[PDB]
Amino acid sequence: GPVPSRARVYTDVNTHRPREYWDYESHVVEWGNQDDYQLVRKLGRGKYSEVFEAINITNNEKVVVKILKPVKKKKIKREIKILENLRGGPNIITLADIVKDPVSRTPALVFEHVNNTDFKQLYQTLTDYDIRFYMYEILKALDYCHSMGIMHRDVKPHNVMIDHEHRKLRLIDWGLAEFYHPGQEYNVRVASRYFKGPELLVDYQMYDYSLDMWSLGCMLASMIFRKEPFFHGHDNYDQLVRIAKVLGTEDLYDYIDKYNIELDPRFNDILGRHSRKRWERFVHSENQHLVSPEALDFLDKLLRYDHQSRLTAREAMEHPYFYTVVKD
Numbered sequence: 001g002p003v004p005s006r007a008r009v010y011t012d013v014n015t016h017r018p019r020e021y022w023d024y025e026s027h028v029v030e031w032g033n034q035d036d037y038q039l040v041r042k043l044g045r046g047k048y049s050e051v052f053e054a055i056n057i058t059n060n061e062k063v064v065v066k067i068l069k070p071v072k073k074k075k076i077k078r079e080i081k082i083l084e085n086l087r088g089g090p091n092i093i094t095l096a097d098i099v100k101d102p103v104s105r106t107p108a109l110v111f112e113h114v115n116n117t118d119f120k121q122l123y124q125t126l127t128d129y130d131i132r133f134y135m136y137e138i139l140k141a142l143d144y145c146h147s148m149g150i151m152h153r154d155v156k157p158h159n160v161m162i163d164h165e166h167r168k169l170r171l172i173d174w175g176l177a178e179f180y181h182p183g184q185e186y187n188v189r190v191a192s193r194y195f196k197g198p199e200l201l202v203d204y205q206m207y208d209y210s211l212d213m214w215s216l217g218c219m220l221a222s223m224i225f226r227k228e229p230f231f232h233g234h235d236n237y238d239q240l241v242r243i244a245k246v247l248g249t250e251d252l253y254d255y256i257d258k259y260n261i262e263l264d265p266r267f268n269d270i271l272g273r274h275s276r277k278r279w280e281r282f283v284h285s286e287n288q289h290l291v292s293p294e295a296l297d298f299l300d301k302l303l304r305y306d307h308q309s310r311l312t313a314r315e316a317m318e319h320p321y322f323y324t325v326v327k328d
């Protein structure tokens with residue numbers, strides 16, 4: 001069988017929390033007044049929700065209303081409990097209210113409004129300094145949720161809302177987030193394809209917070225190299241091949257051998273043999289202003305096959321890449 005794995009940090013946070021903290025199945029939802037919120041315009045529709053701009057008519061302030069699609073009460077209660085546990089934490093989207101939508105017959109989550117700069121304008125204009133600044137802000141959110149026994153499991157650009165005018169960042173959509181329990185096996189069908197960690201792609205279920213750090217690395221690579229997404233697989237198998245063409249196949253085999261994992265035999269005729277590449281290979285005249293020795297070393301230390309080898313969020317915040325960022 002597969003060799004077991006443990007997070008190297010925050011391993012026992014939920015063990016020593018009261019049961020009510022992580023036992024979300026027993027959570028009792030406290031419902032607000034549905035008539036407090038007037039929907040204004042539909043912002044989007046995801047796999048699991050529809051999102052609206054709304055007005056809270058008790059303060060005439062803008063809010064965001066997320067009307068959940070019908071899914072298991074436990075996935076719904078999981079997201080609600082996680083949002084309540086993390087509320088007030090650094091750069092965590094703030095759940096303001098929960099109401100029963102009378103049309104959908106499902107919960108509608110009410111969030112603080114973030115006047116986000118749309119993401120294409122963002123990624124084509126962010127400066128070297130901007131990238132460092134916002135990466136640090138994401139790390140605050142991730143260290144917070146990891147320290148609170150929670151992994152996000154869907155870190156990607158669309159879940160990082162940035163109001164560039166006020167230099168304000170919020171990590172959103174905690175619908176895939178889970179509580180970390182040592183030894184627990186998790187669903188590997190999480191995260192967007194391009195941001196899936198190698199653990200997911202080789203079906204290793206005993207993963208942890210470090211999954212989010214791979215996803216973060218993929219975001220960083222896309223920003224400093226101006227290639228979005230960075231690892232652009234056509235499916236989940238090709239996704240691992242794309243990663244292997246960069247990190248090399250010998251270290252992939254070291255990884256799966258360490259945990260006594262076997263690759264899907266369908267890799268036998270698509271994987272090939274690949275050397276590990278130096279990150280300088282991806283530098284060119286159109287991205288070089290975003291690249292520094294510090295950026296490349298930081299990236300290098302996020303994108304490891306071995307989830308146990310990646311920087312933690314706290315270690316990442318110590319990295320020289322952030323020395324130039326003004327600390328508040």
Ligand SMILES: COc1cc(/C=C/C=O)ccc1O
Nearest residue numbers: 043051064093111172173174
């Ligand atoms: C999709 O999930 C979310 C979206 C937003 C805001 C979106 C604004 O366009 C806030 C919290 C969420 O969980």
